[PDB]
Write a protein that binds this DNA or RNA. Structure first.
Ligand code: ZN
Lengths: 207, 88, 81, 118, 126, 50
RNA sequence: AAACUUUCAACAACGGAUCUCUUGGUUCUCGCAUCGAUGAAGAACGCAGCGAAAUGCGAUACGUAAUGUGAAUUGCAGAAUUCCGUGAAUCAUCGAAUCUUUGAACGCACAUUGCGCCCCUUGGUAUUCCAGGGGGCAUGCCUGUUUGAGCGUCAUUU
RNA sequence: CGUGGAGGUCAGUGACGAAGCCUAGACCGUAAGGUCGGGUCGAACGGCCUCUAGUGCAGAUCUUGGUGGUAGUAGCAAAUAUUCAAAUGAGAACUUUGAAGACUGAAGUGGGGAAAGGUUCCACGUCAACAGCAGUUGGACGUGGGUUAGUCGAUCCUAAGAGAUGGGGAAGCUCCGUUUCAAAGGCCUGACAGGCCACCAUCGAAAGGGAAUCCGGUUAAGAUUCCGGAACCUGG
RNA sequence: AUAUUGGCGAGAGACCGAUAGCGAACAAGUACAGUGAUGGAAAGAUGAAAAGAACUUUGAAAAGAGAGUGAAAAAGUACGUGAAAUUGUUGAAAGGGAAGGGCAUUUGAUCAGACA
RNA sequence: UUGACCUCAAAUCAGGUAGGAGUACCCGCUGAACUUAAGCAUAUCAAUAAGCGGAGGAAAAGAAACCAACCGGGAUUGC
């Protein structure tokens, strides 16, 4: 608040023997009488840099720089050293960068979607996820940051015909257009190489 | 320029985003209320003042009385039909 | 020893405020301005307003207004579906 | 206990007699209180009284409404209560009241229902 | 997941809306499943609870036991089935608070409203 | 004083009927913190200022 | 040498740090507009079967009736049949209602539960008396009514 | 190096016991600090790349809380002064009773009142606290009981005095003023007409003015109040 | 269209996590002081559930010892974990007007690692 | 004499209304000082805090006695 500690009527005394010049509370009879207030130090006084709303919360970025980063992040996938370092237990599947049918996008069903992914070979990744459900380390638990699970693949979609509502729910998974391409989804923690499953249409549309 | 006590009067447009959504929702609401109409009045072309900008044109306020009469209709029907008017 | 002679009140109760601040030689309260109409609302003291204001006590009527507006200031009874 | 729908049919004199019986019963039970530790039937009694009184004050109100029916200046505690402002303010008809000039205006030149393709 | 704007995803909210909830909502919070026999019978998975129901227990130390409710203590979110008690040292005995998430019914006490309820929830009763 | 006004008598009644400790039967209710009556009073200890 | 003083370990005490929780607080955002002379906000006094407070509440007093829910409340006691049900609960909802003395505060006054005025009605043996019950008596202002004043202008007379 | 939080990561540790804590038990690093074993404990937490901050204490006559020496020390010493037996109970320098001794010595250590206090008044039960010792006692604690009015008093009067309305100022909250630049109010016959009168509010004294009451008895506790008897005042 | 530290109903958080955050997470603008204006706090956690300790015994009682519930009383309403100052008992050691620290070693206690 | 009219009045006249709280935001009125100006004094802090009136869900302002000086623009408000 603007007024922490200001809800006090303290004032300093002058010269004494066991005392300080810190302002003491007026009145009598309640225990806060004669107690100090109005300082960085004192119990139930204010603080130093009473924080404010007008901090520099959101930071500006150049558009070209943002796009440069998206491009590099998408380049990340083709090499697969970065992927196998970051996570993404891929070592069985033959090919990188993956492409699949555009017929994926017509899927309307979680079960069919995950069965497709298991056929393709992301079994290892979606069993890494759904075994890495551990709690949060500290006080995030009671600021609604409670569970934490490792991240999983990303299924690009050129145009949705229900895949997004299939993969909304199974954990680890995200979906994303070719236009939006959330860098926070692609290169998390500034660690390149998220595991990606493109479709034919989206890959063509990337050109 | 802070010798005054500015610290109580500060405006911080966090709500840029929320205002935007409310605004788009208001647009859509007015349009669905106004369902067949185009949500905007036809506004003319006008050539600006202040010789710096005289090359440009600008979508002004309202067309005129005389131009409407040259089209061969009246203001009274224009403002129903979806057309603006300035008179001054 | 000059407090043997304090048995003689200045201040006593107000019928409105119940704070024992009715001054007697002046016939005026000091918290709520009674006899006067306009209740004493002084912005330099914020705790005072915070103590005496709305929300504190019963709100016999005004707690019902939100309910009443929400259901539209209606009259009648139910239909016994 | 007592059930109000049983009572809505009864007459005024039946109601008063029933109630006075309940009052005598209550004054007995308040004496029995001082013998016993406690006597929970007094609760049922003291709310039966309220049921009857509520029914009476409801019925007389409805009769007075039927007396004052279809009329202007019905009494203050039977006008609506709504709020000070939403009494001291304009009605539907009184805001719809508008001069004949603008009536002709809104008649001849109303906002037409149009679109744009062609 | 949550795709709405009027429901909470917050601990400080829902613990309050659990603890300080009325009895009319605790009636529903203290639901219970049914045996798979009764499931095949009635065409329904779960129900609220009632004073006059027979039940069998499936979890806790008191697994295998069964009996009839004597009371439902909603103010502790608990149910007291009789023949499930603990002897005090002094020969007296106590009921046992259980959550009806951890019970299973084998017989009910139906009323008109309960038949209407099962009809409301996909009844196959008879 | 003993030429006391009715309202003085009327607030004295409230003090005299507040000044009882907690009925014991409240001690056993479910989820009770209220163990000692803390707004209790005596007459030489605390004035009431009328 | 014991005792005493002094360092340490274990164990125990004073004391409540740390750790882990947390129906709370702040901040941001969104949506909405609703106090009152038909008597508000607020205060006071009283109310529970067994309570002082918080919460609710007004002599119909932790509440009445209406509706939905459909078998409770719960610390003890007790009504418990009301349980295939015009029906339980400190339920939820709330549209009819009650709302003590007070308060802008309204008959006058109010450090007082004081002092009046009017009217309908009931009782006490009553034309007179006494009491009770019910409803009323503020101020400024507006529109209207009813009633008046003034040689202020004016027409028509002893 | 370390700390609270955040993005990722170790498909990390975790009831077969996380964290924290204790440990003259071990290892590391020059050092900040880390690591390990044992004991206690009972539910979350950490390693690494990066981020962000309310980020690290011996001190501020610092703040809040707690605890020590001093110390079983100073001191409980004004108010003449207490003593013996019995009961109670477990226990008496102290409670109760009884026998003696003293005192206040009537401008009192008496009995009643005012202001103020407000159940302290009385009984029963009872001591963990309070009564700067102790306590079986108590203004302490729990449960209850108890305050009776035509005549005492308030209310009524007005005092110095404050204070409405009229009215006038004041930007205005509200102010000057208290009968004044006011159409202020009610009758008296008597056939809607005649006639007379003159104020001005109201508040302010439980000690001033003022209508009238005594005795005896009565209770655990009150009486010009109740009971028994006997008088009075006012208005009908 | 725009403002909004008040009010009503809702949603979130790189916020605080009981000396922080509103002054208040509990019967808080409550207790309490003041003539009054106004000032103004401290105070969270047993356990899953009281299962909150009947019963035997000592004592006037508090209470203790026993037994007992319970996963544990190393959780007994003085209740989670329960640090430090400070305090006691035991064990070890030392001691003539000082103590503590530093370099090396003796005495005593204590201790990890490897022999394959 | 009687009577239109004007003005001024009284009524527990019929019917109506205003006050007061709240007060973050909003329209007005009145209106300081510390501080700052190496000091000091017009000045700044400030047409602000305090005080007072008055409203709503938004208020206020508003279809020009405008800006301009351009091939002229075109109510208001906000950014
Ligand atoms: Zn007052």
């Amino acid at each position: 608040s603007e007024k922490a500690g200001h809800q006090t009527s303290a004032e300093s005394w002058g010269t004494g023997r066991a005392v300080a010049r810190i302002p003491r509370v007026g009145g009598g009879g309640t225990g806060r009488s004669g107690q100090g207030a109005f300082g960085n130090m004192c119990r139930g006084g204010r603080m130093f840099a009473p924080t404010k709303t007008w901090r520099k919360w959101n930071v500006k970025v150049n558009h070209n720089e943002k796009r440069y980063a998206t491009a590099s992040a998408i380049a990340a996938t083709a090499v697969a050293s970065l992927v196998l370092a970051r996570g993404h237990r891929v070592e069985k599947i033959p090919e990188i960068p993956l492409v699949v049918s555009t017929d994926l996008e017509s899927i309307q069903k979680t079960k069919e979607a995950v069965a497709a992914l298991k056929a393709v070979g992301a079994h290892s990744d979606l069993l890494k996820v759904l075994k890495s459900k551990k709690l949060r380390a500290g006080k995030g638990k009671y600021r609604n940051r409670r569970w934490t699970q490792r991240r999983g693949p990303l299924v690009v979609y050129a145009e949705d015909n229900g895949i997004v509502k299939a993969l909304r729910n199974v954990p680890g998974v995200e979906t994303a257009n070719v236009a939006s391409l959330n860098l926070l989804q692609l290169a998390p923690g500034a660690h390149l190489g998220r595991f990606v499953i493109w479709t034919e249409a989206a890959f063509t549309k990337l050109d | 320029h802070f010798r005054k006590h500015w610290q109580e009067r500060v405006k911080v447009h966090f709500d840029q985003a929320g205002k935007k959504v409310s605004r788009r929702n208001a647009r859509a609401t007015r349009a669905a209320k106004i369902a067949p109409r185009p949500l905007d009045l036809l506004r003319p072309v006008v050539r600006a003042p202040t010789v710096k900008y005289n090359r440009k044109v600008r979508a002004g306020r309202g067309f005129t009385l005389a131009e409407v009469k040259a089209a061969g209709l009246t203001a009274a029907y224009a403002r129903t039909i979806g057309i603006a008017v300035d008179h001054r | 020893p000059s407090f043997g002679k304090r048995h003689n009140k200045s201040h006593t109760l107000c019928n409105r405020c119940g704070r024992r601040s009715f001054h007697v030689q002046k016939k005026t309260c000091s918290s709520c301005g009674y006899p006067a109409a306009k209740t004493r609302s002084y912005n330099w003291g914020a705790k005072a307003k915070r103590r005496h204001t709305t929300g504190t006590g019963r709100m016999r009527y005004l707690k019902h207004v939100s309910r009443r507006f929400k259901n539209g200031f209606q009259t009648g009874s139910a239909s016994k579906a | 206990g007592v059930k109000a729908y049983e009572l809505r049919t009864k007459s005024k004199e039946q109601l008063a007699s029933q109630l006075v019986d309940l009052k005598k019963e209550l004054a007995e039970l308040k004496v029995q209180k001082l013998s016993r530790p406690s006597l929970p039937k007094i609760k049922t009694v003291r709310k039966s009284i309220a049921c009857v009184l509520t029914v009476i004050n409801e019925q007389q109100r409805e009769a007075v409404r039927q007396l004052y029916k279809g009329k202007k200046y019905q009494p203050k505690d039977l006008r609506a209560k709504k709020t000070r402002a939403l009494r001291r303010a304009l009605t539907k008809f009184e805001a719809s009241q508008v001069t004949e000039k603008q009536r002709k205006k809104q008649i001849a030149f109303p906002q037409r229902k149009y679109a744009i393709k062609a | 997941a949550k795709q709405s704007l009027d429901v909470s995803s917050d601990r400080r909210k829902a613990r309050k809306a659990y603890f300080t909830a009325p009895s009319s909502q605790r009636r529903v919070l203290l639901s219970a499943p049914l045996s798979k026999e009764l499931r095949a019978q009635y065409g329904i998975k779960a129900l609220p609870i009632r004073r006059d129901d027979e039940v069998l227990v499936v979890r806790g130390s008191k697994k295998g036991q069964e009996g009839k409710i004597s009371s439902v203590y909603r103010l502790k979110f608990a149910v007291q089935v009789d023949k499930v008690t603990k002897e005090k040292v002094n020969g007296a005995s106590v009921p046992i608070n259980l959550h009806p998430s951890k019970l299973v019914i084998t017989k009910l006490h139906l009323d008109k409203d309960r038949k209407a309820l099962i009809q409301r929830k996909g009844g196959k009763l008879e | 004083a003993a030429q006391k006004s009715f309202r003085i008598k009327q607030k004295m009644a409230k003090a005299k009927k507040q000044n009882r400790p907690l009925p014991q039967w409240i001690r056993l209710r479910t989820n009770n913190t209220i163990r000692y009556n803390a707004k209790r009073r005596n007459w030489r200890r605390t004035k009431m200022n009328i």
